[PDB]
């Protein structure tokens, strides 16, 4: 049974939203910078404790990963057109894949301490915030935890256990002990670059961030009138099994997983236009992945299959990176365009791209035929996951919990209206979406005008009730403006 995606949210280096991520990917820029070599999340010690009703003392000892996941879930719910207050006492499931506890490592060198350093609550707190009755669990499969969580959420939705699911991951590099252990293992690139499918591949670079997506059955999404970002057709999770080494991946396992997932999805070769590589930039995993993809999807194709990896832009996010890649695929399924892949100059001699019928996308070109894409995530332990996703088949009122928050929301709304994406939306649709798809907070600001210019000018000027009967098609709006304050242990 197909699964419909109705919204997503992400937090990546130099990309605080889907629009920022698309701008970064289209421009062909790299967010991997020096340590303030890797991708960083421009301060992770800030949180809006008052928005979620959390005391500053509790938030001080709380894992920033929990706060980041809570903010991502709230943003995804806001961008999906669903009011969180209507999700109380409902069968909503939360699946978050976390495999890192650097904050606990730093702290171990109170009564909410134990509470703020537990990996499970990363999801459970969401069930406490949203008041959902669906299952909430944390999965740990290595670097493919997010994709495994997405598959579990899809299976739960198919079985009818959950009505709406939140699936994704997070990973934040805070403690230096993890960096020391990674360097000691000998997997970090000396130049700090991810040369995916390149002859200069000498390791990977580390990244941090997170992402979440909203999953619902296609039938219910069509019945509810929601807009579909993408349609997941099938998913499968397997293990390498009897590999040569515990760390060495197995080609046959990947080939069998790809074959079974593409047989379950019902999509034959010559129908998939893009495949999201794992793209660790290693000298062993990349040739194996290329050989498996060429044996499974490369054969029986009149044209070379385009491939790419998101790790060339932001780096390896480990347990979260997988969902990030899926998010990228979703973008490629919404703009109908492909983004270039960096760190590619000459083909790897160990990778016969001509024989494998594969080619690396290194330019921005339109996507033509529905469009089908695949996202793969391979864990170091041996867990592999693959997801196949296809394309989908005048007063203004704002609200906030603080006057400064209200001004920030008004400014962000004005900026989004000035953007071409806002320009493509009619004022009536924007007003209807603001009135209906946005929750009403304590402090309220209502503006009136005749055209876009007057409303935008009024919103900038002030930046420094059943409205359903008054008013269309639902359109996306900018998310909430968080007032973040510093919170750290001492």
């Amino acid at each position: 049974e197909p699964i419909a995606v109705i919204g997503l949210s992400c937090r990546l280096p130099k990309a605080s939203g889907p629009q920022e991520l698309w701008q970064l990917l289209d421009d062909g820029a790299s967010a991997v910078t020096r340590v303030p070599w890797g991708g960083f999340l421009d301060r992770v010690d800030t949180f809006d404790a008052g928005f979620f009703g959390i005391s500053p003392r509790e938030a001080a000892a709380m894992d920033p990963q929990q706060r980041l996941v809570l903010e991502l879930s709230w943003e995804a719910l806001e961008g999906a057109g669903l009011v969180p207050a209507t999700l109380r006492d409902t069968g909503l499931g939360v699946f978050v894949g976390a495999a890192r506890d650097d904050y606990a490592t730093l702290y171990r060198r109170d009564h909410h301490a134990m509470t703020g350093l537990h990996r499970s609550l990363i999801a459970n707190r969401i069930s406490y915030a949203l008041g959902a009755h669906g299952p909430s669990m944390v999965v740990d499969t290595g670097c493919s935890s997010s994709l495994v969580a997405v598959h579990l959420a899809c299976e739960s939705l198919r079985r009818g256990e959950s009505d709406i699911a939140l699936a994704g991951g997070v990973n934040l590099n805070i403690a230096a002990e993890s960096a020391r252990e990674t360097a000691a293992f000998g997997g970090l690139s000396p130049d700090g670059q991810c040369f995916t499918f390149d002859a200069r591949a000498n390791g990977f670079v580390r990244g941090e961030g997170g992402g979440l997506v909203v999953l619902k059955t296609l039938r219910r999404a069509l019945a509810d009138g929601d807009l579909v970002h993408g349609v997941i057709l099938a998913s499968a999770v397997n293990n390498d099994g009897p590999s040569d080494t515990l760390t060495t991946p197995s080609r046959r396992a990947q080939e069998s997983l790809l074959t079974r997932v593409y047989r379950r999805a019902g999509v034959t070769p010559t129908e998939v236009g893009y495949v999201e590589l794992h793209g660790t930039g290693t000298k062993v995993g990349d040739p194996i992945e290329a050989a498996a993809l060429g044996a499974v999807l490369g054969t029986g194709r009149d044209t070379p299959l385009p491939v790419g990896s998101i790790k060339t832009n932001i780096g390896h996010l480990e347990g979260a990176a997988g969902i990030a890649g899926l998010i990228k695929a979703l973008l490629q399924l919404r703009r109908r365009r492909l983004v270039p892949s960096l760190n590619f100059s000459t083909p790897n001699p160990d990778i016969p791209l001509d024989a494998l019928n594969l080619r690396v996308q290194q330019e921005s070109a339109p996507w033509a035929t529905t469009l089908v894409a695949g996202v793969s995530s391979f864990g170091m332990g041996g867990t592999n996951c693959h997801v196949v996703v296809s394309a989908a088949p005048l007063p203004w009122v704002v609200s906030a919990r603080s006057p400064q928050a209200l001004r920030d929301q008004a400014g962000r709304l004005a900026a989004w209206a000035d953007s071409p994406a806002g320009r493509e939306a009619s004022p009536v649709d924007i007003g209807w979406s603001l009135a209906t798809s946005r929750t009403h907070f304590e402090y309220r600001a209502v503006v009136s005008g005749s055209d876009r210019d007057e409303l935008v000018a009024s919103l900038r000027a002030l930046a420094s009730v059943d409205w359903t009967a008054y008013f269309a098609a639902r359109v996306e709006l900018p998310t909430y403006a968080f007032q973040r304050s510093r919170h750290w242990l001492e």
Partner: protein, 61 residues
């Protein structure tokens, strides 16, 4: 003035003007231990569950 002060310090805030007598105690991040501590501190100068709003408790002193 017994609610703006003597309670913001318990919550850990820096300024007493950052508290609002409009949200419930649970909405401010209060659990059983914090409720007991607040009652003990206010005694010197289950009542919280009876009146879960700071504004209601303000009129009592």
């Amino acid at each position: 003035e017994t609610v703006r002060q003597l309670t913001a310090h318990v919550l850990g805030l820096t300024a007493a003007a950052d508290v609002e007598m409009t949200r419930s105690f649970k909405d401010l991040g209060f659990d059983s231990l914090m409720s007991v501590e607040l009652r003990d501190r206010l005694c010197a100068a289950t009542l919280l569950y009876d009146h879960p709003s700071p504004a209601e408790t303000a009129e009592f002193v």
